Amino acid sequence: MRYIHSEETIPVPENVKVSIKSRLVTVEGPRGKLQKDLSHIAVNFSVVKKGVIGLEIHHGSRKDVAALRTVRTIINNMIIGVTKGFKYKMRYVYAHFPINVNVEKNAETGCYEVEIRNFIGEKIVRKVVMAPGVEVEISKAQKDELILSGNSLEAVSQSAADIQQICKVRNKDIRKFLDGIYVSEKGNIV
Amino acid sequence: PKSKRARVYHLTQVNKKGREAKERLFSNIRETIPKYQHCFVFSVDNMRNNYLKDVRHELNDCRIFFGKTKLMARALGTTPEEEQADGLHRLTRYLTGTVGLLFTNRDPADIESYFSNLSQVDFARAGTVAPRTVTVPPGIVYSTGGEVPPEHDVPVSHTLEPELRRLGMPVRMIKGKVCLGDEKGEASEGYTICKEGEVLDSRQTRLLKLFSICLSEFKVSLLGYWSSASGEVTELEAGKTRPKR
Amino acid sequence: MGRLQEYQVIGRHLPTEANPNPALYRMRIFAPNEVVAKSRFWYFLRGLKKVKKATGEIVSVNVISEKHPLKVKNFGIWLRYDSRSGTHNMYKEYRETSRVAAVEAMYADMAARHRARFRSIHILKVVELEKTEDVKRPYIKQLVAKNLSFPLPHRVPKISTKKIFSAKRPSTFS
Amino acid sequence: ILSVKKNPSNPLYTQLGVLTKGTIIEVNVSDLGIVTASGKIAWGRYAQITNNPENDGCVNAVLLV
Amino acid sequence: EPNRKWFTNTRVISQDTLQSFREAMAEKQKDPYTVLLKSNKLPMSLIRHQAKMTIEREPFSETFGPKAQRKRPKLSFNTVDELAGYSEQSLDSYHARLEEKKLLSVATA
RNA sequence: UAACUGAACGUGGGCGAAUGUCGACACUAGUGGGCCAUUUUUGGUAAGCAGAACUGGCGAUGCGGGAUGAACCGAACGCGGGGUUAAGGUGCCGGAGUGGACGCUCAUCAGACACCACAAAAGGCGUUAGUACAUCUUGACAGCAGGACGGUGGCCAUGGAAGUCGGAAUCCGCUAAGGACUGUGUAACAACUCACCUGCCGAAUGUACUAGCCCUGAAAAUGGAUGGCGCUCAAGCGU
RNA sequence: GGGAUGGCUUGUGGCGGCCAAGCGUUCAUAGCGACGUCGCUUUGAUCCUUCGAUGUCGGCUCUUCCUAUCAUACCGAAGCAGAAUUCGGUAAGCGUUGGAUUGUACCCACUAAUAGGGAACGAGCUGGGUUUAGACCGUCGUGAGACAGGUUAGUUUUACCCUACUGAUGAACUCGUCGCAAUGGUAAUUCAGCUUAGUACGAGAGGAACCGCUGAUUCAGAUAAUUGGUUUUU
């Protein structure tokens, strides 16, 4: 069955400035600016009401109707990112060897850089370079906590996942060796 | 539509009730009416409602119905051409939200006095405003989280700490003990579950329930009552304030 | 299955000494021509009564034309088709301007969707939906909606197949 | 097995004692407790081969009771 | 072809005759210097579970495991003095067995 | 025959369905227990297969199409010209349509010559069209916020066993509803959770089958085959 | 004179009886049947039960291919504490040995491992099947002789042709110098030691790993300063 018309609505706050041209969404907010290319999905954008963006598909199948929900959630997450931001709090725990984490900001690349040392007493020095816009700090309120903050949910969550995957125990019992860096809390900055 | 959610079939004894339970509720309400002079409507909004069994036990001579609101309204009769007795469609305008019916032989003043002096401290649900600030102190976690002195408290169970980490408390296992930070207590501050003048969410209320901290009250508010002899509905204080349908 | 015309075919058993006035049987048959219409009449009559072509006669064959071919109508077709498993019912609806066009759309749709040929489909009933509340299929219910207006995105322009080369890249917006 | 009574394909096969499908054999039935009307122990009874021993590696038979 | 004689007893023998035949035959294989005459025409076919019970009474699942219900061991002793004697005898037998094994770089093939 | 009463054979007279349109000798041959196939029939096998009857073809035979070819389809043949087709085709090789209408399918070596085998009442949280049954403004499905109780720590058993190591029963009350319990958990408790019910919401869903297309449903060994390129609102499939 | 089964096959037995989703079946209520299940086919024993070549396979040199993976690389699961592993997955890049036994296919050792096959088995050389002519023994035959057999000795001997392959020249475009790179091939492999560290882990016995460093196995491409070998330096 080919559905004649299907539509979705995205409310936009007063602080948010959205510019869409040729399926290239640019979202401006108090915290910053995000840009995304949605040219791979056939969507017609409109302004159905003051402060509401209308997504529509004409003569699309069920898959084409369902893709509008992904587009809606992506644009909504961009709005939430430029308005309140995203924050992943991670905890690194250890059994015997204390894990040393040093956070720097490489200025020529303009990006944060997390250096992990003394994981299970290994002499290798692990290094993860963050996505641009992701700010990493060591939490002073709690113990052995990193805080990753940003406007891009994908960038923040992928950087947190990279930190979690780079410290992985190999050839050992995971029931006995519990060490690593884990994503503890996921939320908004504001 | 091959890609569909697999509907899990439950291998348990109790099944869905269905239309038969609705008809049973209709029969019970329509048979309770010619036996009692007064029919009260009470409201319990945003409440746990597990002391209603104790209320039922204490009111032995009374009958309490706590079913679906629209089903009880249809049982009593929404229109004057449908009501079982006169003035019951006047009473049905009080039934919205979480309400209940109380068929009684007693005095309305006695019922009001009982439901006024009845008060039990109960766990808060999501949406209520926190009356105070609760902070679990650093160090070893106990069962109450600092409500009683720590020297009079058992340490909290080791099986609860994955739930505490899921609910956001940064606990860890140190020698079989749940702790914030270090065992003696260092390099961290106390975990603030809630702050005063803040709407509680379900995570905070679940934490308070796990630490046995009660921040609410069990108050049943009587909205009005229909009398069989006079054939009229007397409205009480909460009836003016509560929304009407 | 081709340019179809609906025919009333009336036939009967040959008159004998026992029955000087045998009963007449009338059927409404969709067929490309009168020979196929009479063949289908004899087939369906062999399926129901003790009459065959050698012992019966065709009293009449008439063409049933559409009363209003210029009015958009909704048709409900109840049919039985024969597959590997057996005979199955189908109820389908078509928004057309005549019963014959609805039947051609039916035959094309069953051939496209269930691989059913003309020889394996029995048209049991074709009815007109007088009210729009009788429409049940959502692909017709989306067409009978109020104030139905839609665009036509990505319309490939019709360029002559004999003109091989063009100096401008075509647009798909008209 | 006590003897091969009849191989249906050829009497020479019976003479050679060939065990094929449908061959009647004589078996010792002392372990089944078969007794006559007075108390004599019946220790010889016909059975028929129901499998293909050359394909199965075993001789399977059904008693002719 | 169907025949009535397929469903009859082909060899029968009485109790006393069978017992006398078995006794005489056993007396015959008692002597190794005596050989039978026409042994191919003699009825020589007539001449020629604690683990299961324990497993039937106590299954392997009821002995050890997550579903185990065994709570009383099977002992070879009833009294403390019997246990002391059992331990002493077991130790002496163990030492004797290691002495026997001791009395009784890899080697070449 | 009792009988010109009959039986044959003569004398004389009068007067027939459609469609198409040879016989007898003489002399001389080659072949007379071949292959394949449709239909019918008799026996079987694990599967193969073995036989008979009729008909057609081949051996004896070219031509057009199956890319190719003993058995397939069309069609039978003097030398030429013009016209029209059969079977098969019209994206290029290749003569003829990137023809028209409606749909289906995206395949990690699809499909375009299949019927046989693998192979099954086979497995798919791929995608469509239907059938039956059921729920639903007296609020369906999914979620969120809560309740999830008492006799009772039911009986036996066990060092301990409180719904959740076991065996057997599995009832009643308060009910809106809640199993002598669906799992996590404890040494046993506790605690959490599920079945079930209520509050918010807002209109269509759930289960099992049927029919299409698609994936898997077993593969070896030089580098290769819808004939080749290549083809995705097809140059694939059905009409 | 005439000749010289194949889109087969693979991992899960047969016979006999129950049970059952379903298929069939309502004027006959039979018959098939997936998933299962039950009977026949030593308390870690015994070593005192090896059960018929008519059909032939081996070996040397050397190349390539397949994956149905023995090892190396990565990954998932298991009371997987560590070490050693076991089961499974992607993967053929790279290796997969040296010997004993012929009164006639299994043992031993090294190693990371000693994986399985095809291109033959639907005119290279060399040992058995195997068998021309000589001879002996055994069985059979009156005999010539044959064989249930056993033993010994015993004649096929190209290449200069075409193609393929490996290398080497070459006409035409004046001769020569310096280049580019379409296409074809393609290469590395495994183990050990030092440090980590007697550390993590562990009741103990024991006992890792990443980064870093140094060698060695197999393979490949060169080279002759040195050391052996070679001597028509006659």
Query: For chain B, what's the residue count?
Result: 245
Give which of A5, A43, A56 to mutate to test C binding, by max C Cβ within 10 Å. A5
CA distance A53 to A47: 5
CB atoms within 10 A of CB C145: 11
Instruction: Retrieve residue B151's tokens.
Output: 């020297």
Whether residue C96 contacts residue C127, with contact meaning beta carbons closer than 8 Å, is answered with: no
List the beta bridge partners of residue C123.
C79
Element (H, E) at C37: helix C34-46
Whether the Cβ atoms of residue D19 and residue D25 lie closer than 8 Å to each other:
yes
Q: Is the dihedral of CA E78, E82, E87, E89 positive or negative?
A: negative
Residue ranges of E strands in chain C = 5-13, 24-31, 56-63, 73-82, 87-96, 121-128
Rounded Cα distance between A94 and D17, Å, is 81
* DSSP character at residue E41: G
Residues within 8 A of C (CB atoms), A 29-48 only: 42, 44
Number of helical (H) and strand (E) elements in chain E, helices listed first: 4, 1
Helices A62-83 and A153-166: crossing angle in degrees, nearest 10, is 90
Interruption sites in chain E after residues (C→N beyond 2.5 Å): 48, 104
Q: Which amino acid is at C2?
A: G
By Cβ distance, the residue of A93, A141, A185 closest to B168 is A185
Q: Helices in chain A by DSSP H: which ranges? A: 62-83, 153-166
End-to-end CA distance of chain D, in Å?
A: 17
Q: Coil, strand, or helix at residue D62?
A: strand
Number of A to B CB contacts under 8 A, please give it: 18
Q: Which residue has the tokens 């934490």?
A: B207
- Do β-strands A145-150 and A86-93 pair in parallel, antiparallel, or remain unpaired? antiparallel
Among candidate residues A188, A190, A185, the one with its CA nearest the CA of residue A153: A188
Judging by DSSP bridges, how do beta strands B134-136 and B191-194 pair with one another?
antiparallel
Output phi, psi for A91, to 5 deg: -120, 135
- Quickly list DSSP for B45-80: -S----SHHHHHHH-SSSEEE-S-HHHHHHHH-SST
What amino acid occupies position A190? Answer: V
Pairing state between β A100-106 and A111-117: antiparallel
Q: CA–CA separation, C98 vs C75, rounded Å?
A: 9
Q: What's the distance, CA C57 to chain centroid? A: 26
Provide the 3-class DSSP secondary structure of residue C39.
helix
Q: Which are the contacts of B167, defined by CB distance < 8 A and separation ≥ 6?
A: B203, B206, B207, B210
Q: What distance in Å separates the CA atoms of residue A62 and residue A22, rounded to the nearest whole number?
A: 23
Longest dimension (CA), chain D: 43
Phi, psi for residue B226 in degrees, rounded to 5: -100, 135
Resolution in A: 2.9
Nearest to D43 among E7, E8, E11 (CB): E11
Residue B54 C-alpha from the chain's centroid: 13
C89 touches strand F (CB under 7 A): yes
DSSP conformational letter for D35: B
d(CA A14, CA A21): 20
Q: How far is the CA of C161 from the C1' of F99 (A)?
A: 10
What does the alpha-carbon distance between residue B115 and residue B42 come to, in Å, rounded to a whole number? Answer: 10
Dist CA E12 CA A77 (whole Å): 96
Four-CA torsion D65, E2, E3, E4, nearest 10 degrees: 40
Structure determined by: cryo-EM
CA dist list (Å): E102 to E96, E97, E98: 10, 9, 6
Would you call A116 exposed, middle or buried from its count of C-beta atoms within 10 A (0-12, 13-18, 19+)? Answer: buried
C137 to each of A63, C105, C145, C148, how far by Cα in Å? 20, 15, 13, 17
- Structure token pair of residue A151: 């406007």
d(CA B146, CA B10) in angstroms, rounded, equals 41
Contact B140, B178 (CB under 8 A): yes
For B134, left (φ over 0), alpha (ψ -120 to 50), or beta? beta
In a 3-state reduction of DSSP, which class is residue B203? helix
- What does the alpha-carbon distance between residue C78 and residue C75 come to, in Å, rounded to a whole number? 10
Check if the beta carbon of residue A65 is closer than 8 Å to that of residue A57. Answer: yes
Question: Which residues of chain A have a CB within 8 Å of the CB of B172?
Answer: 93
- With residue D27 as reference, give the H or E element that holds it: strand D24-27
Cβ atoms of A151 and A145 closer than 8 Å = no
C-alpha distances out from residue B229 to A21, A156, B36, B232, Å: 74, 70, 10, 8
Q: Please, do chains C and B touch (3+ CB pairs < 8 Å)?
A: no
Virtual CA dihedral for C28, C30, C33, C37, nearest 10 degrees? -50
C43's tokens: 């087939």
DSSP state of B240: H
What does the alpha-carbon distance between residue A77 and residue C48 come to, in Å, rounded to a whole number? 67
**Residues A55, A45: contact at Cβ < 8 Å?**
yes
Q: Which of A188, A117, A178 is nearest to A157 (CA)?
A: A188
Strand, helix or coil for residue C152:
coil
Query: What DSSP letter does each residue of B113-159 carry, written as one string?
Result: HHHHH--EEE---TTPBPSS-EEEPSEE-BSSSSSS-GGGSPBPPTT
Sign of the C-alpha dihedral, residues B29, B35, B36, B37?
Answer: positive
Which chains are within 8 Å of A by 3+ CB pairs? B, C
The whole-angstrom separation of Cα A85 and Cα A106 is 22
Nucleotide nearest to A125 (CA to C1'): G211
Q: Which long-range contacts (CB under 8 A, 24 or more apart) does A52-56 make?
A: A52/A9, A52/A10, A52/A11, A52/A12, A53/A9, A53/A10, A53/A12, A53/A18, A53/A20, A54/A7, A54/A8, A54/A9, A54/A10, A55/A7, A55/A8, A55/A9, A55/A10, A56/A5, A56/A6, A56/A7, A56/A8
Nearest to B142 by CA among B173, B178, B168: B178
Q: Is the CB of E51 under 7 A from strand G?
A: yes
Q: Is E37 helix (H, G, I), strand (E, B) or coil?
A: coil
Q: Provide the 3-class DSSP secondary structure of residue B26.
A: helix
Q: How many residues does chain D have?
A: 65
Set of chain A residues whose Cβ sits within 8 Å of the Cβ of C148 = 4
Handedness of CA B86, B87, B90, B92 (dihedral sign): negative
Sheet with A52-60: strands ordered across:
A3-11, A52-60, A44-49
DSSP bridge pairs for A18: A27
Measured between alpha carbons, how far is A17 from A70 in angstroms, rounded to an integer?
21
User: What token pair was written down for C71?
Assistant: 């009015």
CB atoms within 10 A of CB B77: 19
Residue environment code for B32-44, b if the CB has 16+ CB neighbours within 10 A, otherwise e: bbeebbbbbbbbb
What residues have CB less than 8 Å from B105, skipping those under 6 apart? B36, B37, B38, B61, B62
Strand partners, B180: B139, B171
**What gap in Å lies between CA C142 and CA E38, rounded to an integer?**
102
Query: What distance in Å separates residue B163's CA from the closest CA in chain A?
Result: 12
| Residue A26: partners with Cβ closer than 8 Å, 6 or more residues away | A18, A19, A20, A33, A34, A35
* Angle subtended at Cα A67 by Cα A63 and Cα A70, rounded to the nearest 5 degrees: 150
DSSP structure string for E60-93: HHHHSSTT----S---S--SHHHHHHHHHHHHHH
CA-based end-to-end distance of chain A: 44
Distance CA B65, CA B80 (A): 22
**SS3 state at A163:** helix
Strands D3-6 vs B139-140: parallel, antiparallel or unpaired: unpaired
The residue among B37, B52, B183 whose CA lies nearest residue B110 is B37
**Residues B63/B32, Cβ–Cβ less than 8 Å:** yes
| Amino acid in the structure at residue C27 | M
Do the beta carbons of residue B160 and residue B178 sit within 8 Å?
Answer: yes
CB within 8 Å of C61: residues ≥ 6 apart: C7, C8, C9, C10, C34, C37, C38
